[PDB]
UniProtKB/Swiss-Prot annotation:
This is Adenosine receptor A2a. Residues 1-5, 65-75, 142-163, 396-403 are extracellular. Residues 31-40, 99-118, 189-371 are cytoplasmic. The chain holds residues 3 to 307 of 412 of the full protein. Adenosine binds at residues 159, 390, 414-415. Keywords: Cell membrane, Disulfide bond, G-protein coupled receptor, Glycoprotein, Membrane, Receptor, Transducer, Transmembrane, Transmembrane helix, Ubl conjugation. Ubiquitinated. Deubiquitinated by USP4; leading to stabilization and expression at the cell surface. It comes from Homo sapiens (Human).
Length: 444
């Protein structure tokens, strides 16, 4: 069997695989309401782009490898679409990655930044850029201006109509490499967040939250950082002025993470001084190690000293280092009943003296980082070979040419992006995974 038959069969097989898997992803989000979030707005968009790739782009990419005689612009149109439909997938993928950057790195401002309306607005921007970039050759940047096929006709091959300086300068750098570098920067950032060094600052950030902008707290007072009240005055300018005084520089109501940590360490200093001046809490705070002290401070920040001093029985056990007995006793209060998540983490800290309960909470980010490593690795493996090949053909024509099977393999790889990248991310999600199981077992 000759090569062309192998290429078409493999290219067609990938088309079905790209269609089946991405139909599944949209099906799951369609019936399961736990998947009807804003993140999966982007996931479904990518699945749509990938169904079109399997339906239209792949048959086109095949077509523009047969070399039949065609009107130069009629063959140019075919080529540009496969460029459009594939651009649409790259940018759609980039939108998912960024949604995950904000969701993990900046969870408090996420729901505000990324809404259904903002999402559909971004998905729109993605397709508009895809058509603009993909159809640019039709504007005039084509190899058609100039025996074998006749006048006005050329042998319909990709390179015969699409210039190589468009594929290297415009298409590769601006629309393939940049997204990859962006997506890679996303992965590395989430990787450093998931594997971050833990401390009282990180503890309170997990329990209460970090805000690098000024915000009104539950009692309407302006606040910044981790619950650091600036002023009770209704004047935002006054809040901004108090902020500048504590920071030193002029902030405009915005600080860096490093500045919120200097505000926090000052609040911690304040909390300890109050603990040391409380006759009930002083003997216990002195008898604890650093990590358990941090958990005692966690309680002060939430209830104040008088509220902590009310735990006479639990405090007693802690001073005697009766960790287990102290824990079960603390599990009884209305503190636990009203904020069980936070109290359960604080108690585990008392019982173990480690950050365990607060490193367990980062496993969700660890899971997010590994899912993105797969996205960026598959993306680099699927797209770099083909575009590296173009770069060598454009900057060094006389160079040793790669064999036809490796060249066409790079094309196959570029189209395998549409079957792995969205689906693999979905399959790593328990909800998605269970929904896939439910639909295939029932309907199939
Ligand atoms: C969002 C981004 N989107 C994309 O990148 C999509 O665009 C398509 N694409 C992107 N570069 C593509 C591309 N480069 C051209 C490249 C090449 C050709 C074939 C296979 C891989 C790469 C090339 C290399 C060397 C010389 C010229 C072009 N050739 C095709 C595409 O069909 N070739 C099929 C039709 N041509 C051909 O048999 N020519 C042959 C290739 C072998 N001979 C050679 C070899 C060395 C030197 C000279 N003569 C004779 C011409 N398609 C491409 C593909 O669908 C991508 O998924
Ligand atoms: C983005 C739109 C950019 C459109 C750029 C058109 C480039 C053009 O028309 O000419 C390039 C020429 O082939 C270079 O040698």
């Amino acid at each position: 069997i000759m090569g062309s038959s192998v290429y078409i069969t493999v290219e067609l097989a990938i088309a079905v695989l790209a269609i089946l898997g991405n139909v599944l992803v949209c099906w799951a989000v369609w019936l399961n309401s736990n998947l009807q979030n804003v993140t999966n707005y982007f996931v479904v968009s990518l699945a749509a782009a990938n169904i079109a790739v399997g339906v239209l782009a792949i048959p086109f990419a095949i077509t523009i490898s047969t070399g039949f005689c065609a009107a130069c612009h009629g063959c140019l149109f075919i080529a540009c679409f496969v460029l459009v439909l594939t651009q649409s997938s790259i940018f759609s993928l980039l939108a998912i990655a960024i949604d995950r950057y904000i969701a993990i790195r900046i969870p408090l401002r996420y729901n505000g930044l990324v809404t259904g309306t903002r999402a559909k607005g971004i998905i729109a921007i993605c397709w508009v850029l895809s058509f603009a970039i993909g159809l640019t050759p039709m504007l005039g940047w084509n190899n058609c201006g100039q025996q074998g096929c006749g006048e006005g006709q050329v042998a319909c091959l990709f390179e015969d109509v699409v210039p190589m300086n468009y594929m290297v300068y415009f298409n590769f750098f601006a629309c393939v490499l940049v997204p990859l570098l962006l997506m890679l920067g996303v992965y590395l950032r989430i990787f450093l967040a998931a594997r971050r060094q833990l401390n009282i600052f990180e503890m309170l950030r997990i329990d209460e939250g970090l805000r690098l902008k000024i915000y009104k707290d539950t009692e309407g007072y302006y606040t910044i950082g981790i619950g650091h009240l600036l002023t009770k005055s209704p004047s935002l300018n006054a809040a901004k002025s108090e902020l500048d005084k504590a920071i030193g520089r002029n902030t405009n109501g915005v600080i860096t993470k490093d500045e919120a940590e200097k505000l926090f360490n000052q609040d911690v200093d304040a909390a300890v001084r109050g603990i040391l001046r409380n006759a009930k809490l002083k003997p216990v705070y002195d008898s604890l190690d650093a990590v358990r002290r941090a958990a005692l401070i966690n309680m002060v920040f939430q209830m104040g000293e008088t509220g902590v001093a009310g735990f006479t029985n639990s405090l007693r056990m802690l001073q005697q280092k009766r960790w287990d007995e102290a824990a079960v006793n603390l599990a009884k209060s209305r503190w636990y009943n009203q904020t069980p998540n936070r109290a359960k983490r604080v108690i585990t800290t008392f019982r173990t003296g480690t950050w365990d309960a607060y490193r367990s909470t980062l496993q969700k980010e660890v899971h997010a980082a590994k899912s993105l490593a797969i996205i960026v690795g598959l993306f680099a493996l699927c797209w770099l070979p083909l575009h590296i090949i173009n770069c060598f053909t454009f900057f060094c024509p006389d160079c040793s040419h790669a064999p036809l099977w490796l060249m066409y393999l790079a094309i196959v790889l570029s189209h395998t992006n549409s079957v792995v990248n969205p689906f693999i991310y979905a399959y790593r999600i328990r909800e998605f995974r269970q929904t896939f199981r439910k639909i295939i077992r029932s309907h199939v």
